[PDB]
Design a protein around this motif. Structure first.
Motif, PDB file in Angstrom:
ATOM      1  N   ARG A   1      57.389  34.818  11.002  1.00 39.09           N
ATOM      2  CA  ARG A   1      56.370  35.648  11.033  1.00 39.09           C
ATOM      3  C   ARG A   1      56.745  37.137  10.901  1.00 39.09           C
ATOM      4  O   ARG A   1      55.669  37.894  10.735  1.00 39.09           O
ATOM      5  N   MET A   2      58.047  37.538  11.364  1.00 38.69           N
ATOM      6  CA  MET A   2      58.503  38.814  11.577  1.00 38.69           C
ATOM      7  C   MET A   2      58.956  39.343   9.981  1.00 38.69           C
ATOM      8  O   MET A   2      59.003  40.674  10.029  1.00 38.69           O
TER       9      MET A   2
ATOM     10  N   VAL B   1      52.758  40.567  16.316  1.00 36.19           N
ATOM     11  CA  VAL B   1      54.202  41.216  16.455  1.00 36.19           C
ATOM     12  C   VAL B   1      54.390  42.268  15.615  1.00 36.19           C
ATOM     13  O   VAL B   1      53.774  42.516  14.577  1.00 36.19           O
ATOM     14  N   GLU B   2      55.340  43.064  16.332  1.00 38.16           N
ATOM     15  CA  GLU B   2      55.248  44.476  15.689  1.00 38.16           C
ATOM     16  C   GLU B   2      56.715  44.679  15.253  1.00 38.16           C
ATOM     17  O   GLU B   2      57.799  44.597  15.772  1.00 38.16           O
ATOM     18  N   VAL B   3      56.898  44.795  13.855  1.00 35.50           N
ATOM     19  CA  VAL B   3      58.354  44.785  13.111  1.00 35.50           C
ATOM     20  C   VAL B   3      58.609  46.296  12.829  1.00 35.50           C
ATOM     21  O   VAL B   3      57.830  47.080  12.358  1.00 35.50           O
TER      22      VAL B   3
ATOM     23  N   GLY C   1      61.830  43.550  15.946  1.00 30.09           N
ATOM     24  CA  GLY C   1      60.566  43.053  16.324  1.00 30.09           C
ATOM     25  C   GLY C   1      60.244  43.060  17.748  1.00 30.09           C
ATOM     26  O   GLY C   1      61.080  43.794  18.377  1.00 30.09           O
TER      27      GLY C   1
END
Ligand SMILES: [Mg+2]
Ligand SMILES: [Mg+2]
Ligand SMILES: [Mg+2]
Ligand SMILES: [Mg+2]
Ligand SMILES: [Mg+2]
Ligand SMILES: [Mg+2]
Ligand SMILES: [Mg+2]
Ligand SMILES: [Mg+2]
Ligand SMILES: [Mg+2]
Ligand SMILES: [Mg+2]
Ligand SMILES: [Mg+2]
Ligand SMILES: [Mg+2]
Ligand SMILES: [Mg+2]
Ligand SMILES: [Mg+2]
Ligand SMILES: [Mg+2]
Ligand SMILES: [Mg+2]
Ligand SMILES: [Mg+2]
Ligand SMILES: [Mg+2]
Ligand SMILES: [Mg+2]
Ligand SMILES: [Mg+2]
Lengths: 56, 81, 205
Positions: free
Chosen positions: C103-104, C170-172, C179
């Motif tokens: 997902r990242m 999620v913040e990449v 992440g």
RNA sequence: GAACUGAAGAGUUUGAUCAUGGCUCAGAUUGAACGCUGGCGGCAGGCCUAACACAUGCAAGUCGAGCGGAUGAAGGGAGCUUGCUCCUGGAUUCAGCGGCGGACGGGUGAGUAAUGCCUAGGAAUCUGCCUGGUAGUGGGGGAUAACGUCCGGAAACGGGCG
RNA sequence: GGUCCAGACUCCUACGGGAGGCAGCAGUGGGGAAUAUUGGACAAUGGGCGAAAGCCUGAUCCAGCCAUGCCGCGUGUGUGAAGAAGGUCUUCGGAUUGUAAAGCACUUUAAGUUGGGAGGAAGGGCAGUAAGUUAAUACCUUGCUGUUUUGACGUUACCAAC
């Protein structure tokens, strides 16, 4: 014939002269060592039976 | 006599100890009278290394209980802190 | 074990997208995904309620790439937990380390993220983890080892994850590939086509 | 704040139908066994049958700071002469007497239907070593092992006298 | 894993005469569908003796064997249509095995090799100093200080490189 035995420090190799079953200590094999040296506490493969020598 | 010793639990190469008050002629992990804390040889993180009940330990020492060598050393260390 | 083989017959048999390729080119123009695999492909064959439940469970399992015994463990844990096991199962599946790495944008698919995780290239809390089942908690910081930050795989995976939709949980940090796991994504954050009621129905029998 | 939250049916008697009723199936578990196949690790488990019979090793000893005795170092030396003898001292080691331990730890489930086990009670007892108090350790006596001695026994070893 | 008596069964013998009890740990025969090593150390926790070093400990801590169970991880990842060759079916049009393979390009977990590397260790010997006990700077006990000394597992867990 000069009867050369190769090294006595090779892994043991011999032939079975006879074999019997003892009610107190299981299968007992009378073997003639051909070359190498056989020591107690060694993994032995004879025929189809294998195992390691408790006693000699 | 009545002694205070370490009963071993945990698992292979990961020992944990219970500080137990036992009749001396019992199994190391058998019947006991009372448990008065524990000892962790590995601990780390949020785990505590050793904890003892001061009240129960003093009461049993006053009644004539002979701690082992490790129990003596650990108990004096706990009393130090 | 692991399912290793043709990763597109599964999509045809399940009959949905069921992302298993990178999604670069397409799905329709690789397999004519309208027929069940095998010789008897043109037949339709309407199936029974047990068949629908089985197909739903198989679809979820093949999406997340887990085998049956681990899935039963997940179901038991979801039933043990409070609050409606139906989405508890999805909460628990969506927290695996390989899925989070996918997902990242670090990996193109789940198999490639599993490749990355198993080969010791991911650190969770600044320390290496290589178990593709590690339940990451809220607030962890999945990153990439410095000796593994120059693999091209991550470059293509990131540039292709740039266009698939915004996960928004999620913040990449794209420049250095780090992440952050804010929280588990709620049921409304996932696709509303999986009927987990069928899964719970199937296992409650 | 928590210590729960939980319950599916199907096939088969008839030309067909409803009921009664049996059989069978879909689940979860084994101290499992067998067949085919087989890479790794972590944690556990492993004579359920003959409480059938056992070759061979080990599994219970310790105390010389309780007591005789015999083993008798290094040394100080003394003599003769390269090494020996002698003495004083004597370190170590224990066969015997004696004190503790051996009633613990370990194994098995034959017997036992109640002198067992489980739960709740009580009264008429003992309890080495352990803890805290109280009062003491004064003075004699006859022995005996070890040991020396005498025979028998293949040995195991046994017997009489001091 | 003591004594005595009787019994069943094995054995020794020099034929006069004695010995034995694995339902302790290994091990054997036998029965059975079926269940493992004559392993290492007392380093750790316990138990016996000792005053204290210390001795003993098949308890215990560990190793060996067996997919017996539970859990976890591998046996690769992306692209790839001449929709190759072969197989199978066919209404002879084709479909399917199938992005599957080949090709192209990546990665090295586990296993292999090499090199680093904890934690399980508390204690013991010696030396010094300070307090308490007395009658005493003695012996002894206790705090502390310095030095020396301990690991079966073990080529440990773990880590780095090819
Ligand atoms: Mg498995
Ligand atoms: Mg009919
Ligand atoms: Mg038995
Ligand atoms: Mg002696
Ligand atoms: Mg017992
Ligand atoms: Mg019984
Ligand atoms: Mg009766
Ligand atoms: Mg015995
Ligand atoms: Mg045995
Ligand atoms: Mg017997
Ligand atoms: Mg048999
Ligand atoms: Mg078997
Ligand atoms: Mg010990
Ligand atoms: Mg001694
Ligand atoms: Mg011994
Ligand atoms: Mg031994
Ligand atoms: Mg295994
Ligand atoms: Mg098998
Ligand atoms: Mg063809
Ligand atoms: Mg250490």
């Amino acid at each position: 014939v000069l009867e050369l035995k190769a090294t006595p420090s090779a892994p043991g190799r011999g032939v079975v002269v006879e074999s019997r079953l003892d009610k107190g200590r299981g299968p007992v094999a009378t073997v003639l060592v051909q070359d190498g040296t056989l020591r107690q506490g060694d993994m032995v493969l004879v025929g189809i039976n294998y195992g390691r020598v408790r006693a000699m | 006599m009545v002694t205070i010793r370490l009963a071993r639990g945990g698992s292979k190469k990961r020992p944990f100890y219970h500080l137990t008050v036992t009749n001396s002629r019992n199994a190391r992990d058998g019947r006991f009278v009372e448990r008065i804390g524990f000892f962790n040889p590995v601990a780390t993180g949020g785990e505590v290394r050793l904890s003892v009940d001061q009240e129960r330990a003093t009461y049993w020492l006053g009644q004539g209980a002979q701690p082992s060598e490790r129990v003596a050393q650990l108990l004096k260390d706990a009393a130090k802190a | 074990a692991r399912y290793i083989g043709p990763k597109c017959k599964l999509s045809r048999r399940e009959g949905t997208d069921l992302f298993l390729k990178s999604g670069a080119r397409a799905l329709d123009s690789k397999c004519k995904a309208e027929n069940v695999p095998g010789q008897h492909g043109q037949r339709r064959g309407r199936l029974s309620d047990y068949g629908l439940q089985l197909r739903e469970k198989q679809k979820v399992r093949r999406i997340y790439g887990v085998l049956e015994r681990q899935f039963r463990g997940y179901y038991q844990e979801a039933s043990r937990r409070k609050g409606s096991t139906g989405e508890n199962l999805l909460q628990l599946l969506e927290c695996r380390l390989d899925n989070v790495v996918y997902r990242m944008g670090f990996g193109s698919t789940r198999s490639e993220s599993r490749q990355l995780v198993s080969h010791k290239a991911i650190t969770v809390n600044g320390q290496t983890v290589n178990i593709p089942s590690y339940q990451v908690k809220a607030g962890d910081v999945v990153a990439v080892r410095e000796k593994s930050k120059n693999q091209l795989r991550i470059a293509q995976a990131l540039e292709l994850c740039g266009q698939r939709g915004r996960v928004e949980w999620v913040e990449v940090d794209l420049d250095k590939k780090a992440g952050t796991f804010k929280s588990a994504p709620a049921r409304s954050d996932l696709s509303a086509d999986i009927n987990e009621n069928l899964i719970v129905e199937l296992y409650s029998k």
